[PDB]
Amino acid sequence: AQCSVDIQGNDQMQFNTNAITVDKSCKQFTVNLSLPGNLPKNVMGHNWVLSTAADMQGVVTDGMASGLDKDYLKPDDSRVIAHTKLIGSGEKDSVTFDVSKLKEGEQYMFFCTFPGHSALMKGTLTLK
Amino acid sequence: AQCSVDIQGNDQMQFNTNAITVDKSCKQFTVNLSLPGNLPKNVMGHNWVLSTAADMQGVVTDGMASGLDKDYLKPDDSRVIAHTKLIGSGEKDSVTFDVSKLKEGEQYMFFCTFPGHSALMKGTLTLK
Numbered sequence A, B: 001a002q003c004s005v006d007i008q009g010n011d012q013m014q015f016n017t018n019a020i021t022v023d024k025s026c027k028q029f030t031v032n033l034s035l036p037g038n039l040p041k042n043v044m045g046h047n048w049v050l051s052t053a054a055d056m057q058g059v060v061t062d063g064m065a066s067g068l069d070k071d072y073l074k075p076d077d078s079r080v081i082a083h084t085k086l087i088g089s090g091e092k093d094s095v096t097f098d099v100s101k102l103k104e105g106e107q108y109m110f111f112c113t114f115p116g117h118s119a120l121m122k123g124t125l126t127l128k
């Protein structure tokens, strides 16, 4: 779309895209996450989290450690540019962030921090 | 080991072996599963399930559909040759099955049926 993208996370532990291109003229950008599956949040919760590629590993590792009540994200984690909540089946959530937090030339990764899901639920985002 | 194998499943959704060999001379075979990790059963529970390569997908789909209370395995599923319980961090379980249930020149697969894990947590078993 233009300054929005719709993404789904499913019961097979995958996202329906692995690359998001943010257009340089967007003042803000929205990610709409919907979970069309059947499994509950405590076993297959998904969220969409954005960080630079170099920070992804620490966000996932510290996320895993904060637990389900913290939506597997370290509270006030400085490395996280934007994130949705951790949702379960049949739920939807959206996040809008300011594009000026991104800079051209940096590799960004989006991913799910529910334990083990980043193996498959990850993609690139780049401001072009 | 003689007619037995000790196998580990970890918080990164990996088993420590991806190929089990069963000797035809064995009357029985035992699989001893341990989880040395730290994540609980509802978020990273692992089990070890055996079926033919042909029935694995049906066992996985129906398993997913049975729910956490049924250890993500259909009750009395004819296709499951042997399986452990679904266990979490710090636990261990063993299954011993008769080698007469395996036929020479049939491909078998072992896998974890916890939602999302079988595409990564799987390996081959063969009768030699």
Ligand SMILES: [Cu+2]
Binding pocket: A009, A044, A045, A046, A047, A112, A113, A114, A117, A121
């Ligand atoms: Cu997820």
Ligand SMILES: [Cu+2]
Binding pocket: B009, B013, B044, B045, B046, B047, B112, B113, B114, B117, B121
């Ligand atoms: Cu598992």
